[PDB]
Amino acid sequence: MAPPSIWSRIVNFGSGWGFWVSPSLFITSTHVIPFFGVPTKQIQIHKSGEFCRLRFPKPIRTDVTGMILEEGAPEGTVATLLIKRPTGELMPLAARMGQMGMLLPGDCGCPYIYKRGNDYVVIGVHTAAANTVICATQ
Amino acid sequence: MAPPSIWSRIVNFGSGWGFWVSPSLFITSTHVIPQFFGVPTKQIQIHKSGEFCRLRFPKPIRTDVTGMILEEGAPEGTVATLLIKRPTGELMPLAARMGTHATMKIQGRTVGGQMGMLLTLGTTPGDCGCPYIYKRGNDYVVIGVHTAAARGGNTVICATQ
């Protein structure tokens, strides 16, 4: 259901994963932050509570289109937790959810997506789980 | 292009990449082999046919994937898709018109494989190990692995067998 281009946005970072919103915007969780060739000082790091945004002065992923990132998902939205594993396996997981989710480590940082019209929407990143799941917000 | 499950079979293997044809079969390029997947190099059944390296492991490692048809190249004129992954994460499916088998010198190294040509950015040595794939009905089919590329040309070599 999620095309390869959106999977390619998910890239391993630190101890887990992160996600490309644009050629220059990259989101992840704070527990995986130990950058991509760019000095750690030439980046905007705006941590926001187990959620972190990284903005580079130059595009890094020019292959990637600008995708909408919202705070969360309206209650009842069936988001999709796109977990990647070190072996290369892709693990899509249907989550009912806007901040806490019900399914139907090193995974933290993987994004939450839900399709609205002919365009995808990011709503946060994987924070922790132990059927329960949690999604970090802006 | 191709679905995610096919792309997820492509993984970094040393200097370049490799391809999980089945849960236990792993094709790659002999030159990208590091100097595997948490397995003793002795325990792995290695086979080589030029710059083509086929690794059959004793235990199914990649249980998420399925078996896929692996063939010795493709007939002349077939348009295969070289599935390139770059270390930045980007995906680059490139169409290639497979030609005949040839032998050439590149980087002080005599290379052999099924020549192909990229059709309307370009390949890099870090891209070796990635698969040439063309769909035959419903079945996706692997024909070999990227092993070399001409200095300036769009000629490309596909390790076969």
> Which residue ranges make up each domain of chain A?
4-55, 68-136
Q: Which residues of A10-24 are buried (b: 16+ CB within 10 A; e: fewer)?
A: bbebbebbbbbbbbb
In terms of Cα–Cα distance, which of A30, A69, A26 is closest to A49? A30
Class of domain A4-55: mainly beta
Provide the experimental method for this PDB entry.
X-ray
Sign of CA dihedral A24, A27, A28, A33: positive
Q: Residue B143 is encoded by which pair of tokens? A: 């024909």
Residues 60-119 in A contacting B (C-alpha not used; CB under 8 Å): 60-61, 63-64, 87-90
Nearest to A88 among B2, B3, B8 (CB): B8
Q: In whole angstroms, what is the distance from residue A9 CA to residue B79 CA? A: 27
Contact A113, A120 (CB under 8 A): yes
The whole-angstrom separation of Cα B103 and Cα B150 is 12
Instruction: Name beta bridge partners: A102.
Output: A132
Same fold, A4-55 and A68-136: yes
Residues 6+ apart with CB under 8 A from B136: B69
Cα–Cα dist B128/B90, whole Å: 15
Token digits of residue B79:
């348009």
Contact A88 B1 (CB under 8 A): no
As given in the structure block, the two tokens for residue B121 are 């950015």
In angstroms, the CA B97 to CA B90 distance is 23
User: Can you list the alpha helix ranges (DSSP code H) found in chain B?
Assistant: 4-8
Distance of CA B106 to the CA centre of its chain: 18
How far away is chain A from the Cα of B27, in angstroms, using its nearest Cα? Answer: 15
* Bridge-based pairing state of the strands A52-55 and B155-159: unpaired
Give the contacts of B153 (CB within 8 A, at least 6 positions apart). none
Query: Where do we find the tokens 């992160």?
Result: A18
Both ends of chain A: CA-CA distance in Å? 25
From chain A, pick out residues whose CB is under 8 angstroms from the CB of B89.
8-11, 20, 61
Supply the DSSP symbol for A103: B
As given in the structure block, the two tokens for residue B32 are: 């990208």
Where does residue B154 rank: exposed (0-12), middle (13-18), buried (19+ CB within 10 A)? Answer: middle
Which candidate, A30, A70, A81, places its Cα nearest to that of A53?
A30
Chain A residues touching residue B11 (CB < 8 angstroms): 87-88
C-beta atoms of B89 and A8 within 8 A: yes
Q: Please pick, among A108, A110, A126, A135, the residue that the annotation labels catalytic.
A: A108
**Fold classified for B4-56:** Thrombin, subunit H (2.40.10)
Query: What 8-state DSSP symbol labels residue B32?
Result: G
What is the β-pairing status of strands A68-69 and A119-128? parallel
Specify burial of residue A27 (Cβ count, 10 A radius: 0-12, 13-18, 19+): buried
DSSP secondary structure code for residue A91 in this structure: E
CATH architecture of A68-136: Beta Barrel (2.40)
Q: How far is CA A47 from CA A34, A116, B59, in A?
A: 13, 27, 43
DSSP state of B39: S
What residues contact residue B67 under an 8 Å CB cut-off, 6+ apart? B21, B22, B23, B25
Contacts of A10 in chain B (CB under 8 A): 89
- CB-facing half-sphere around the CA of A64: CA atoms within 13 A: 26
Strand partners, A19: A10, A27
Helix then strand count (H, E) for chain A reads 1, 12
Could A88 and B2 be called an inter-chain contact, meaning their C-beta atoms sit closer than 8 Å? no
The one-character DSSP state at B30 is G
Close Cβ partners of A9 (under 8 Å, ≥ 6 residues apart): A19, A20, A21, A61, A64, A67, A111, B89
What kind of architecture, by CATH, is found in domain B69-159? Answer: Beta Barrel (2.40)
- Say how far apart CA A10 and CA A61 lie, in whole Å: 11
Residue keyed to tokens 């937790």: A81
